[PDB]
Amino acid sequence: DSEAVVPADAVSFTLLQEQLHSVLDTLSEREAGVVSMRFGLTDGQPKTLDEIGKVYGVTRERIRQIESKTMSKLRHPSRSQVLRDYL
């Protein structure tokens, strides 16, 4: 069958979730929160920028810039060696 959850894939994905959450925790609290909302790491629906900019009380563009800074920081070679192997 095709619906059977491959245990290898399941455990690899769980380890990916743990590593991703830890790497986000390495970042600042607000930065981790906004990037997680932008990519739905807590909920299956990511929120676009201005939709992040309602519960947090920041503008649709302030959120855009800090999201860009979070992407730049994550792209740093520091917090990339662990995530590269997971693809």
Added chain:
DNA sequence: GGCGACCCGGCGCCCGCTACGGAGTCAACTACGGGTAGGGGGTATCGGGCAACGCGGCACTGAACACCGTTGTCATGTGCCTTG
């Protein structure tokens, strides 16, 4: 007329795992009518890209006063000399 064989149906199963071949197949038709679905066309709505512009530390603005420090200064007090 219950016993009786016998007869028959009817059914029940028939060690263990790996490992080990493929193969796949014969007889209507058209007309309509709708409805969904596709396509492009155009339109309201959401999302992405830039400098001021919010702040804050401090810094300058020294300006304008304050804080001691100082040699300005004064009218007023001792010591020697001349005359009562």
